């Protein structure tokens, strides 16, 4: 008879999608090194890597591209519904109460289709208008003539900005978007199991998330004009492809997870009043 | 399965010696009270009791004490070894090492009587001789005289007590001579288990040992006895018990023998240096 | 009845596999490591958990090196023993009374593994030659361990390949899980003491398989027919010293309990 | 320098150093105190340093005497 504590070095699962050596420094998406994806790509083509299981055409990313610019707008209702928080509260007990109750409003091949879509577009607006609604002010609304990263730094600043910042700050995202196994995404994969919809799964991650790369991180982040308690729900879009990667394979596999445990407490005894 | 830790609550051994009951304030040794015990008896005649099992009538007292008195003494190979010990040590080492120092010159169906009239006649003699030859002097030596309390008060003090202190002293000897199971008795026990003499036992006991007390510190302290000796005192008494443990365990031959989990590595390669 | 079958402790060290056939030393077999490694580096694998660098094995042959010589109290007190007492009764008052002498109570952690290491072997080659007639015979300073263990017991310095064989056999002892020593050692540890007297209490209880190559491999080195048992302790004393150091973070104690069969409530009478 | 040495031995366990025959007077001093052999420039050194002490006039010690 033997036990394992915590967990450790036990296999969980058989994956495909990351690989990280260590010995020198390798840390690769599906199987290309992280300098040439670095250099010369753009964020949507990393998360149609990352989520599909290949490289795309033109005619296809052009596609990809121009529907997930149609779905950017937040409804009326939402922002009647957001009005009634207190303004006391934070930005993560906001990620995961709205995160959860945009699966009462629409949930039931295309299945699998559009739920990424919607996940895709409106999470920066979400975040964005409670920003506002914080403070006294009204939201703001997005434009139709503008780009990912640069459209979400309008939303939270109504200034425009150059295109330089604009690129800087997408590669920052770029070299964001993946890991290994950890806590986060193994409850993920424990929640996903049960074989529910993408909306719970990303509730329940997000309520577990709540010199290094930290110290550039802070300060490319503070010249840019971003508050400080915004800092960590950034995090939380660049990394929402890593997560719908695995929902889509862990549920080819059909299994439960439950393991048992070693009771060690007191025995037979008898009720006193 | 299961585990408790610290074989907390397991049962390990029968017994017949004594019997404690802590909601009503019972406590038998082989079944006569402690308080109409403590009322006409002394620390032999109880012994006898422990030790053998059943009240001694005359002939056999006048026996027994007559013997425990006519060996009281010791050689000049012990004194002689003694000397060369250093001065700035716990008494206590001191007491381990010469109980298992006098296993050489005494060792290999009256072996059991013999053992226990000397590892009760020899104890004060050599606790006494230590405090003395510590701090620069010459041990004193017995007279045929006294009694066991009495005698032992004269060997440390050099100046003879009034008879009352002997009999308040002999009081506070046979309150402490048993209890239930513990730790000291635990390790004597688990070293008798395999036929070893009882000189052997009583070194590992000592070994292991290093409300009453707020009171017993008084008592102590008036009578003339430093601080650095109140826990060998609390030896002397308690021999009688171990002692009787070690008789039990002689009539069923059976040795003690638990297991372990694990929780370590498993399969790897020695790397060169 | 004898406690069998019954999880006492959660432990690390050892582990051995019966029906497949299978022992190991921390995680590595023990075929592969009796070939490439030396008596020193394994006990220092036994105590820490992790196989050292150049210059640690270094200093720590050089720190053991330093302190095989015996001061003239020890030996002096020696003599005074009797001329017909048993070996293993010389081994419990020796290592019970190197006790007095070096007692402080990581700076005291790493002291006392080292004296304890070094200064057993020339115990018992003394107490052979003071009962025999004569004085004890000096360590060298040119040798190593066994070599110069040999040549304490017996004058004649013997070939290298003796040694050899010598220092795999005292590897293929040194660890082995719960038995009747072991656990006396831990019941004596529990309660927070230091290693002098754990060590005197564990040699107070120890007094075709592998019971015929260890009587013919030990007969032709040139060992008396006496000291076959202590030779055995000196192997032995590395495993034990690791448990007093894995038991000390756990802090909790022992006290099981019992069950009576006792008459109660008798008439008192002390004359019989 | 004997005395000085031994009881300086005496004092911590160990046992007395017995003097060598092939040597001189500072070097084998300093051997009976270290049991290492010196190398012979320290030798001079001592031995010049123990010259320019050796007297001086009328203070206690030499009225005592």
């Not at 033997?2 to 690769?28: C, H, K, M, W, Y």
């Amino acid at each position: 008879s033997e036990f394992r504590p915590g967990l450790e070095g036990v296999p969980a699962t058989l994956s495909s999608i990351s690989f990280v050596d260590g010995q020198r420094g390798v840390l690769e998406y599906r199987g290309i090194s992280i300098e040439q994806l670095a250099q010369q790509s753009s964020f949507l083509e990393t998360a149609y890597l990352l989520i599909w299981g290949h490289l795309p055409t033109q005619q296809e990313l052009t596609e990809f591209e121009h529907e997930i610019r149609y779905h950017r707008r937040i409804k009326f209702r939402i922002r009647d519904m957001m009005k009634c928080f207190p303004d006391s509260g934070h930005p993560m007990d906001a990620l995961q109460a709205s995160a959860a109750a945009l699966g009462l409003f629409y949930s039931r091949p295309e299945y699998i289709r559009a739920a990424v879509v919607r996940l895709l577009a409106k999470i920066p607006t979400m975040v964005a208008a409670f920003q506002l609604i914080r403070k006294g002010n009204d939201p703001i609304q997005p434009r139709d003539e503008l780009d990912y990263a640069a459209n979400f730094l309008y939303m939270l600043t109504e200034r425009e900005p150059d295109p330089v910042a604009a690129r800087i700050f997408d590669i920052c995202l770029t070299l964001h978007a993946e890991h290994t196994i950890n806590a986060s995404t193994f409850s993920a994969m424990v929640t996903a199991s049960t074989l529910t919809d993408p909306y719970a799964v990303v509730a329940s991650a997000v309520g577990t998330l709540a010199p290094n790369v930290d110290f550039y991180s802070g300060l490319v982040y503070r010249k840019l004009g971003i508050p400080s308690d915004l800092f960590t729900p950034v995090f939380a879009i660049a990394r929402v492809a890593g997560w719908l990667a695995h929902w889509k394979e862990q549920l080819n596999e059909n299994r439960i997870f439950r393991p048992t445990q070693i009771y060690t407490g007191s025995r037979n005894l008898d009720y006193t009043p």
